Enzyme design. Structure first.
Site, PDB file in Angstrom:
ATOM      1  N   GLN A 176       1.023  -1.109   0.040  1.00  9.12           N
ATOM      2  CA  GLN A 176       0.166   0.072  -0.094  1.00  9.12           C
ATOM      3  C   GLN A 176       0.968   1.172   0.281  1.00  9.12           C
ATOM      4  O   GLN A 176       2.058   1.416   0.736  1.00  9.12           O
ATOM      5  CB  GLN A 176      -0.797   0.109   1.347  1.00  9.12           C
ATOM      6  CG  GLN A 176      -1.831  -1.137   1.086  1.00  9.12           C
ATOM      7  CD  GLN A 176      -3.228  -0.630   0.678  1.00  9.12           C
ATOM      8  OE1 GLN A 176      -3.662   0.264   0.423  1.00  9.12           O
ATOM      9  NE2 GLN A 176      -3.608  -1.767  -0.253  1.00  9.12           N
ATOM     10  N   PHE A 177       0.768   2.094  -1.031  1.00 10.39           N
ATOM     11  CA  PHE A 177       1.577   3.270  -1.136  1.00 10.39           C
ATOM     12  C   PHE A 177       2.473   3.110  -2.432  1.00 10.39           C
ATOM     13  O   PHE A 177       2.776   4.107  -3.003  1.00 10.39           O
ATOM     14  CB  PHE A 177       1.926   4.049   0.082  1.00 10.39           C
ATOM     15  CG  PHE A 177       1.374   4.090   1.305  1.00 10.39           C
ATOM     16  CD1 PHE A 177       1.816   3.877   2.635  1.00 10.39           C
ATOM     17  CD2 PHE A 177      -0.086   4.177   1.146  1.00 10.39           C
ATOM     18  CE1 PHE A 177       1.121   4.038   3.712  1.00 10.39           C
ATOM     19  CE2 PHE A 177      -1.008   4.215   2.435  1.00 10.39           C
ATOM     20  CZ  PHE A 177      -0.314   4.104   3.555  1.00 10.39           C
ATOM     21  N   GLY A 178       2.924   1.997  -2.962  1.00 15.04           N
ATOM     22  CA  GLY A 178       3.743   1.986  -3.994  1.00 15.04           C
ATOM     23  C   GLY A 178       4.734   0.945  -3.960  1.00 15.04           C
ATOM     24  O   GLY A 178       4.500  -0.528  -3.385  1.00 15.04           O
ATOM     25  N   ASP A 206       6.006   6.986  13.564  1.00 18.66           N
ATOM     26  CA  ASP A 206       5.844   5.635  13.253  1.00 18.66           C
ATOM     27  C   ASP A 206       6.976   4.635  13.344  1.00 18.66           C
ATOM     28  O   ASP A 206       7.191   3.815  12.411  1.00 18.66           O
ATOM     29  CB  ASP A 206       4.888   5.553  11.862  1.00 18.66           C
ATOM     30  CG  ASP A 206       4.268   4.225  11.684  1.00 18.66           C
ATOM     31  OD1 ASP A 206       3.977   3.652  12.664  1.00 18.66           O
ATOM     32  OD2 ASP A 206       4.250   3.946  10.468  1.00 18.66           O
TER      33      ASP A 206
END
Ligand code: 13J
Length: 263
Positions: free
Chosen positions: A18-20, A127
């Site tokens: 997810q994101f690339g 994070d």
């Protein structure tokens, strides 16, 4: 800091999510690199482009370097220092049983060194987790992705009540108010130490986001991993103090962990 697309060659895909996508590639007159290609709508590219120069000027041997941004064409690409052994989470899981407790403490020390630099620089990671620490030559661990959740557009990952929010690493003030600070990074670092000493186990395995919030709020804390000494588990628990004021700064943690390692 702007990289022309003609300066990059893509050789092999090494990861996707997810994101690339992440490719192993080469950057002209420089070196082998990891290139992240960003999926449309996954990030606020404009907000990132505004902050890129500052992020690139941050430099420390324990931080994965952002070398530049290829923005002349959609999709955009971010170019990073290549980390030969990939992410720490998978490195621990795939080699479970092949680590001495001293090596696991040395991995925590490397992350703490990077974090102490970010803390001094007033950069909040937001994070910190084993999945975004990377392993280089001679098992050197480097921190990556500090501040990157600022640019994530899916509110399910960034809102503290989002269905995809990374609550497992969040302090109570983060899961309650998105009140980020170096002390909320200290809480995450305690969870990272637990991931390291548990050789890549998932913290609060099988607990929903709502369950993690209730458990933490009522005093539950992660159990002591087999490979963590009494002293190491005591440091983990100090990272998980309810009040951020009661948690040690990374400057204090760095000395405490070094004292434990040095004996
Ligand atoms: C555990 C992770 C994993 O599975 N692997 C294996 C596949 C390659 C992965 N890998 N990632 C990087 C890397 C380092 C630093 C930053 C990034 C990155 O893409 N950050 C990022 C970019 C954009 C966004 C937006 C959506 C806001 C968020 C985060 C990726 C690697 C490096 N440098 N070397 C080797 N493997 C790397 C790890």
């Amino acid at each position: 800091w702007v990289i022309d697309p003609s300066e990059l060659t893509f050789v092999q895909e090494i990861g996707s999510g997810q994101f690339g996508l992440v490719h192993l590639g080469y950057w002209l007159n420089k070196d082998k690199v990891a290139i992240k290609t960003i999926r449309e709508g996954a990030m606020s590219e404009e907000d990132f482009i505004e902050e890129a120069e500052v992020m690139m000027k941050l430099s420390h041997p324990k931080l994965v370097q952002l070398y530049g941004v290829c923005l002349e064409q959609a999709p955009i690409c971010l170019v990073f220092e290549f980390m030969e052994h990939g992410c720490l989470s998978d490195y621990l899981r795939t080699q479970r049983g092949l680590f001495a407790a001293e090596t696991l403490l040395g991995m925590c020390l490397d992350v703490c060194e990077g974090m102490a630099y970010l803390e001094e620089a007033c950069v909040i990671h937001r994070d910190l987790a084993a999945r975004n620490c990377l392993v280089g030559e001679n098992q050197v661990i480097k921190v990556s992705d500090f501040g990157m959740t600022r640019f994530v557009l899916d509110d399910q990952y960034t809102s503290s009540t989002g269905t995809k929010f990374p609550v497992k690493w969040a302090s109570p003030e983060v899961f309650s108010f998105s009140r980020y600070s170096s002390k909320s990074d200290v809480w995450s670092f305690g969870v990272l130490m637990w991931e390291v000493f548990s050789e890549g186990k998932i913290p609060y395995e099988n607990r929903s986001n709502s369950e993690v919030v209730e458990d933490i709020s009522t005093g539950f804390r992660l159990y002591k991993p087999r490979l963590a000494s009494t002293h190491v588990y005591q440091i983990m628990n100090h990272c998980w103090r309810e009040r951020p004021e009661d948690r040690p700064a990374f400057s204090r943690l760095l000395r405490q962990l070094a004292e434990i390692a040095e004996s």
